[PDB]
Symmetry: C3
Subunit: 209 residues, 3 copies
């Protein structure tokens, strides 16, 4: 019966979480997972309103003696507008991508992002690429804009200062895990984050509807 208000409230509880996230009041989140030759995983996460981005350098461990980055997986929350996703990369600690005079400052990589799904629902977006063995490090920057459900100008006369503030307010986290197993068990799963593991298995929590 629909006299089951406990069930109805539980249903609304989950749904409202899903919907608040995709409102412009909600966060847009990016994760950069760097996979090292020793099986360890380094993750950078930043969460912010309106837009979010990361600019990082992943270096060979122990002054060049330890493990080296082998691959990168970039994850965006479902609140991102996939068409706004941009990436700039260098394979070096020294401006790797050809010459400044001829470089485009970014590529629109949205079309390469796969949908991470649980129960038919999009829990995130994933772009995975491996690094050339010939390289010991990668400088990488990625950026995404929150879906704008309306025709609302977040960058209009009055609203632009809020976006400037969003830049100050963004929170960044950096963690290293010993293996993807630890990553899944202690980072991804407990926080209900979207993820694809090495076996192409999807993680995350469907909240709609």
């Amino acid at each position: 019966s629909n006299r089951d208000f406990r069930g109805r409230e539980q249903r609304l509880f989950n749904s409202e979480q899903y919907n608040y996230n995709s409102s412009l009041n909600g966060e847009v989140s990016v994760w950069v997972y760097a996979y090292y030759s020793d099986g360890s995983v380094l993750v950078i996460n930043k969460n912010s309103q309106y837009k979010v981005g990361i600019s990082e350098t992943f270096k060979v461990l122990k002054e060049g003696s330890g493990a080296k980055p082998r691959a990168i997986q970039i994850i965006f929350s479902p609140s991102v507008n996939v068409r706004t996703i941009k990436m700039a990369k260098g394979n070096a600690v020294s401006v790797p991508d050809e010459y400044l005079q001829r470089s485009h400052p970014w590529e629109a990589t949205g079309i390469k992002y796969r949908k991470i799904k649980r129960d038919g629902e999009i829990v995130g977006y994933s772009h995975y690429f491996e690094l050339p063995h010939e390289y010991n490090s990668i400088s990488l920057a990625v950026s995404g804009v929150h879906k704008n459900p309306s025709s609302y100008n977040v960058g209009s006369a009055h609203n632009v200062m809020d976006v400037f503030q969003s830049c100050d307010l963004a929170l960044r986290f950096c963690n290293r895990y010993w293996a993807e197993l630890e990553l899944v068990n202690h980072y991804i799963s407990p926080n209900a984050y979207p993820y694809l593991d090495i076996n192409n298995h999807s993680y995350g929590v469907a909240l709609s509807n």
Copy 2:
């Protein structure tokens, strides 16, 4: 007599400093003081035009073996618009505040800021909060916008690039002091910064009028 031009110029000297600061040509400044279990104090200061903010992580010293953060005091210069103040925090190195799906990206904490006064003049604003003993660290972000004395649109077609530049131009300082006494004697007082100590004593310099 008002034939005392030395006195009159001294009066204008002080007043002009007070007033330039609160003009849009002046700085808005934020300080984040982190109080550690060993009595030491770590301070982060950033100063910038138009708006300013800080995003930091305060961790337990010596890889988790040393002292731990116990409390935070956030200070804004008098040039801040208290109503624009925003704060986002996590108690963890891992996205502490519940779940991303349900998180508001900030809280307006202005109403909790006390006025730091010297001689009846507001020299700054202070928000103090203690950290749960149960936690070994805190990731914290705070943001404030300069008071806009006029109806001037700093984020208008032409002026927005200046605000973007203000972001590049902001200066950040990080210092650690052995005790609040050292902090007061060698940081707060010499630089004429506003402050409240553990005994609720106010520091700073009245310049008006």
Copy 3:
């Protein structure tokens, strides 16, 4: 003859590189070279669309026991609008420039920038200043805006979010070289960057026309 299409294409190849850089699709780049008492050189480079800036602290090596910064050379790519260049500095790890109440948040230093030329062509802009011996460090911030060839409003309703993204996407590099010779041989020259050495010799590559 103009039947030499190999020559004509080579000519267009070089020219197009020059021109793309100065289009709003191209990068604006800044370098900050810090010259240390031991002859070593530390360089910070950031490259980004629309505008670029750096905010750094150059400290005495080995916790204050090693070499100390003696001089700074700031280089901008030719795509910068020299009139938009701004600099804010402190000689301390503690808000060096007088008192916050009376500080202008930056100086327009464009008029002090020399043109670095190769073959009559501007390959960059250079501002060089020495540091007071009395100081062990310098906190420095510099900012420049890309030349806007048109009357195009990059900070208009729609375009402002792209500039916000440009902030996320900017790539920063930090390198230390043992002597200016190494710097020239392994950093400046291989990457075709503009530069002036200690003997006032100009480096870079003319690409026009």
